[PDB]
Write a protein that binds this DNA or RNA. Structure first.
Lengths: 312, 117, 177, 248, 60, 159
RNA sequence: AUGGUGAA
RNA sequence: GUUCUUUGUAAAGUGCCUUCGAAGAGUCGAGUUGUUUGGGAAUGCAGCUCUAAGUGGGUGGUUCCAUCUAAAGCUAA
RNA sequence: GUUUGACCUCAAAUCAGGUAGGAGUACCCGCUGAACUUAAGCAUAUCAAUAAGCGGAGGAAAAGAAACCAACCGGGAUUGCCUUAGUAACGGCGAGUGAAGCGGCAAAAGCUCAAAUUUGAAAUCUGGUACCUUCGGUGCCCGAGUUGUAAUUUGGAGAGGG
């Protein structure tokens, strides 16, 4: 074994970029496995951090001078490092990838429900909300759901992505008080690692099992609700869970959050109609009110707990 | 003349096609660089996967509500020397579910399991 | 351009302006090594008219020599031993002290590809110019060898050993003269 | 700290444009409201939209009540606002840069809207942009434990919604969004309930990329926002939806 | 088989290893190449075109 | 002790005048290697398939500047004080005073390098100008002649 | 004499 | 000999007419201490002191005239 | 701005690419330098601008395109041979030392810088890298370089235009 103070001196990269690389391979001190760091020093990602540092000296001499014309040139002729060749070393078999995608969506579904700060870039956030609704696009399409669990923390989910019971906590749609303690440098690098990981899987679930990746979006449905009813999808049963709500057209109402709840019914198969969409054939209306008002005979009035009772 | 000679040479090279004009290079970069992460790539530590909760929720059997003394005793105790990361509450309605204030930290502590362990 | 103004400025050596530059530089060059590399020639007009182009492959070594064989050639010989890969082209006076004299000898790398190309300087790459200073083939060496044209240089024009061997060895033909 | 003489003249001459700019507008819409057209520039309400090749579709403005979200911008360079614009920006409480609010556009609102045009950016938002703004940023000035109210903190709950408003049918945070996207009667009460929206600034830092991205984006404001300075200047509308992706 | 494999992986790239280069001698590994020696100054190329060494005979 | 033609430097142009000089000079950048190359490829793409006036820039070679003063074509001449051989530029303030070309000793050689796409420049000059900046240039000429020349008339004297 | 090898 | 390509308001040459037209300094030289020669007009060189000029300067011939252009470099037989 | 950013300088590395040493040595180029011996003893003349030693090259080296020789109805880079000639000249005129121009011939070949601005565009080069027909060419990136790299000029002039 070697020392934590040794490896940074050994690698001669940034300590943060040591910590940034160390997330990428998945190396943990048992102390630092000395062959593994010797295994690390010949890796193409290590090429880029030296180059990304030497980009930064070459750019600040640019703007420091005042030739912004030359400064602007540096960006357009600047690569990005990919994390494809951190993946295939780490995820040999695709079914091993889906047993680590547990933590992946457990991060990435958090990040969609985040305000953009100085600390976090919104492009990451607007990808995260995009990737979530890309995730839910496939899940709601081919009905791949098994179990649900709404709790205090968030809303757990359970689905057999080729049989592995993934579990991904969607938090509740509220402002979230960002604590001063946390670090969005380490967490983002996980997201950075997880984001590209989530691309190939969604490519895999589409282009090998289902559809084309990624499908186009529908903008005008995204103007209304910005969720799962938008982002339309085109290609080119055994469980009773998948047979639930089969031609059972629902109305949802303004009490519940539709976004957490339109997902399940579309994961089952029933149609979802909201109050919120403007801003009959339905036969259910979910309400959380001590004072209900309309009460037609065609609609069946059930509090949404029972819908979660229908799943478990 | 100098610049006029130099252009004529760059005319000559595109006459021979050694050089692409800059407008088509954007078109070389328009077809490229959107097609990113869009290819097949497939065709030992067990990572300590998290414990699956079932039936401990927003609307539980209410004996799972903590005793009022252990409420403060959970608060007076500090973190990680600690059994629950919360205290469960009771909600009859779906609407009354609060802002789950500590979900950011729950991943940040989980994240430290992922590489430091 | 400026090289006419510098050419004439370097004439008045004991004048107030250049006198002051001497007394600063003489102190500064004593702080540094005996043989060391200057990044740029201090008298660039002189460097040019002795064949220096400010491109990659040209090197200006500054050299210190004692006072009271010639000192210019000794200066070139000292840098020849230290910088062996280089070829001595020419040298010139820059500054002097009561005890020491300074020369800024100019060198060319024959190994550097910027010199192996251009035909104005690729002659120095030819192995016949290895240690030009060690054979007195530099400006100062050819000066001390007494090699010019005239009545003055009769006994030492085309090699003083060559003319001696020619004059003091008997020559006989097949059919005797 | 010391003031260079360059500053105090540049500040003088820029505000004494704005002291001249709103004076003319305040004379004009006086003569538009009091209807004494013998010599005016234009006789109607103008709203222009600037979107994308960089289209400038100038429109009229009918009396139809619409919904505008307005973000405070920090422009222009040397402009101490006058008394007439301290007020409107304080009555909309937009005194902090990068802070937003929904308001309703009437023909009472539009004439005062030409006052604050160089200081903010305005526009019509979408329902997603209505919704994803509120459930991601939201402040509630409400009582703390016993004493300290002004912890504005967070739209955590739907029963704090029961607490303050409550009796107007205001039962959940999704129901608030009904009261804003649709012009409801209690729209101003819930507008008085969500006082700022602390949007982040886009560039948010010094640095390598950050200096460059500031410079590259700063000129982008100069195209997507022009300062008309006219008597019958139009009110310029930008797309809020693309802006909130930059600000959320 | 090792040496042909190394030559295949260093297929026509500048500065391949010293153990694969031509031995020849030391002096011939120094001394200007065909291109470098034949490299002539721009003025002399013009003087070659304008006045080349002509071919002639002298009688009738 | 410094002989008067040395330390005619160091008595350089002050804070505000130097700032205003660069406010003028940074407008007149030479087109950089990247910018020039891309322009000529634009010319190649356009003129091969299907007029311009002379563009003004600063002039920055020592030989070029010593040409331009005494041509006479130079209007403003900036001169760095820090030069490795000082004797390279010592005659230059005297040349400008003799030919009557307005000059200014600027502080920092790399400061000249920034406006000119080089590391260092030692001397920079603005021969000609666009019509809009003509009055501003001539005002700066008077500003420099009042601050630099008239204040330091005794710069030719005093060791 | 030049240059070298050895040496209570 | 056999071909494949030659381009760009490109690269020169020649005669006339018109307007300009910069060529090497601690070097030349001077005194002296040594070395070099058979060298008489210290030849050549080095050391040390001082150190120039531009209708200039170096070298020779009986008052002018002739002759080259140093203090940079390359080159076969 | 009590940050930060330009440069210049000094560093660094088991990085990338190179290169110098040593042997041989007849010839060549430099540096250093005796004594036996000759005129009578020996300070010069004389052994000797030798031998040994030292440094450096090549197939040759060195020299070389005049700051030359001449005194003529002028020659015309250098090197070598024949001759000038044992002449001029020097030498306690003595041991003796010892050229050169001309002439005949061998072989013949000339040119490149620095010098006043490309200023309507550093027009130049290194290196890395990607390909190609690889003693190299091209695209792209990087560096050098305005304290000047290319084109144009070297007194035989030359340049600007017409």
């Amino acid at each position: 074994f070697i020392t934590r103070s040794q490896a940074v001196r050994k690698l001669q990269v940034s300590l943060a970029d040591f910590r940034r690389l160390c997330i990428f391979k998945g190396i943990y001190p048992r102390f630092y496995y000395a062959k593994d760091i010797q295994y690390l020093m010949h890796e193409p990602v290590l090429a880029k951090f030296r180059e990304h540092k030497t980009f930064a000296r070459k750019l600040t001499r640019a703007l420091g001078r005042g030739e912004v014309s030359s400064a602007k040139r540096l960006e357009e002729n600047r690569d990005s490092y990919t994390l494809d060749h951190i993946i295939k070393e780490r995820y040999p078999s695709f079914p091993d990838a889906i047993r680590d995608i547990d933590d992946a969506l457990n991060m990435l579904f958090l990040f969609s429900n985040l305000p953009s700060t100085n600390q976090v870039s919104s492009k990451i956030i607007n990808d995260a909300q995009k990737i979530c609704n890309q995730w839910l696009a496939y899940v709601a399409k081919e009905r791949l759901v098994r179990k649900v669990f709404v709790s205090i923390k968030g809303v757990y989910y359970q689905a057999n992505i080729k049989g592995e019971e993934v579990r991904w906590l969607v938090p509740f749609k509220f402002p979230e008080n960002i604590p001063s303690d946390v670090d969005f440098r380490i967490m983002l690098t996980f997201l950075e690692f997880y984001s590209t990981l989530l691309h190939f899987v969604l490519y895999k679930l589409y282009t090998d099992s289902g559809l084309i990746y990624p499908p186009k979006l529908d903008l005008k449905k995204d103007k209304i609700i910005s969720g799962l009813s938008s982002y339309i999808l085109e290609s080119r049963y055994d469980s009773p869970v998948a047979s639930l709500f089969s031609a059972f057209v629902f109305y949802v109402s303004r009490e519940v959050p539709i976004d957490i709840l339109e997902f399940l019914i579309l994961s089952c198969g029933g149609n979802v109609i909201s109050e919120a969409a403007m801003d009959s054939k339905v036969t259910h209306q979910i309400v959380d009110r001590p004072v209900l008002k309309n009460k037609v005979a065609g609609r069946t009035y059930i509090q949404p707990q029972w819908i979660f009772d229908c799943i478990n | 003349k100098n610049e006029a000679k130099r252009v004529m040479k760059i005319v000559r090279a595109i006459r021979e096609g050694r050089i692409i004009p800059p407008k088509k290079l954007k078109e070389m970069k328009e077809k490229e660089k959107i097609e990113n992460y869009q290819y097949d790539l497939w065709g030992l530590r067990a990572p300590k996967l998290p414990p699956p909760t079932n039936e401990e929720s927003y609307n539980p059997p209410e004996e799972y509500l903590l005793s009022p003394e252990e409420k403060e005793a959970w608060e007076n105790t500090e973190y990680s020397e600690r059994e629950r990361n919360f205290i469960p509450q009771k909600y009859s309605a779906l609407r009354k579910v609060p802002g789950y204030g500590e979900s950011i930290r729950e991943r940040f502590e989980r994240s430290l399991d992922l590489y430091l362990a | 351009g400026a090289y006419k103004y510098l050419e004439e400025l370097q004439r008045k050596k004991q004048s107030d302006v250049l006198r002051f530059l001497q007394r600063v530089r003489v102190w500064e060059y004593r702080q540094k090594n005996v043989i060391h590399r200057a990044a740029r020639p201090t008298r660039p007009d002189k460097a040019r008219r002795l064949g220096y182009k400010a491109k990659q492959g040209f090197v200006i070594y500054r050299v210190r020599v004692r006072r009271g064989r010639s000192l210019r050639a000794t200066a070139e010989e000292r840098v020849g031993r230290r910088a062996a890969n280089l070829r001595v082209l020419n040298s010139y006076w820059v500054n002097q002290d009561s005890t020491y004299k300074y020369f800024e000898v100019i060198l060319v790398d024959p190994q550097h590809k910027a010199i192996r190309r251009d035909a104005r300087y690729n002659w120095i790459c030819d192995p016949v110019h290895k240690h030009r200073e060690a054979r007195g083939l530099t400006a100062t060496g050819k000066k001390s060898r007494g090699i010019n044209k005239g009545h003055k240089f009769n006994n030492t024009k085309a090699g003083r050993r060559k003319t001696w061997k020619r004059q003091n060895t008997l020559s006989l033909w097949r059919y005797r003269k | 700290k010391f003031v260079r003489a360059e500053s105090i003249v540049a500040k003088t001459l820029a505000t004494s444009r704005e002291k001249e700019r709103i004076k003319r507008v305040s004379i004009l819409e006086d003569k538009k409201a009091k209807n004494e057209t013998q010599h005016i520039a234009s006789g109607k309400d103008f709203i222009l939209k600037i979107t994308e090749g960089l289209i400038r579709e100038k429109t009229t403005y009918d009396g139809k009540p619409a919904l505008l979200f307005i973000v405070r911008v920090r422009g222009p360079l040397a402009v101490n606002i006058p008394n007439k614009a301290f007020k409107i920006l304080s009555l909309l409480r937009l005194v902090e840069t990068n802070t937003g609010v929904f308001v309703k556009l009437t023909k009472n609102v539009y004439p005062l809207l030409k006052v604050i045009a160089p200081y903010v950016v305005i526009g019509k938002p979408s329902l997603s942009s209505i919704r994803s703004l509120i459930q991601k940023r939201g402040r509630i000035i409400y009582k703390g434990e016993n004493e300290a109210e002004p912890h504005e903190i967070v739209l955590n709950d739907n029963n704090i919604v029961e607490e303050q408003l409550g009796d107007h049918g205001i039962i959940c945070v999704e129901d608030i969004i009904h009261e804003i996207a649709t012009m409801g009667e209690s729209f101003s009460v819930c507008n008085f309930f969500l006082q700022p929206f602390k949007l982040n600034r886009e560039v948010s830092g010094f640095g390598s990329l950050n200096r460059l991205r500031k410079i590259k984006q700063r000129e982008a404001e100069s195209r997507t926002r022009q300062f008309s300075n006219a008597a019958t200047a139009p009110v310029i509308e930008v797309d809020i939806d693309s802006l909130l992706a930059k600000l959320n | 088989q090792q040496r042909e494999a190394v030559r295949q992986l260093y297929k026509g790239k500048k500065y391949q290893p010293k153990d694969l280069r031509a031995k020849k001698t030391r002096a011939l590994r120094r001394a200007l190449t065909k291109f470098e020696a034949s490299q002539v100054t721009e003025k002399q190329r013009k003087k070659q075109i304008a006045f080349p060494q002509r071919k002639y005979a002298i009688k009738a | 002790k410094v002989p008067p033609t040395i330390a005619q430097f160091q008595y350089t142009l002050d804070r505000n005048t130097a700032a205003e000089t660069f406010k003028l000079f940074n407008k007149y950048r030479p087109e950089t290697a990247a910018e020039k190359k891309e322009r000529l490829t634009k010319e190649a793409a356009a003129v091969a398939e299907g007029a311009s006036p002379k563009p003004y820039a600063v002039k920055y070679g020592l030989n070029h500047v010593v040409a331009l003063i005494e041509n006479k074509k130079a209007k403003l001449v900036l001169i760095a004080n820090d030069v490795d051989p000082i004797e390279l530029v010592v005659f230059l303030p005297a040349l400008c005073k003799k030919m009557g070309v307005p000059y200014a000793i600027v502080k920092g050689k790399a400061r000249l390098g920034t406006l000119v796409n080089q590391k260092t420049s030692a001397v920079a000059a603005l021969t000609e100008v666009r019509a809009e900046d003509e009055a501003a240039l001539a005002k700066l000429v008077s500003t420099i002649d009042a601050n630099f020349a008239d204040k330091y008339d005794e710069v030719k004297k005093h060791w």
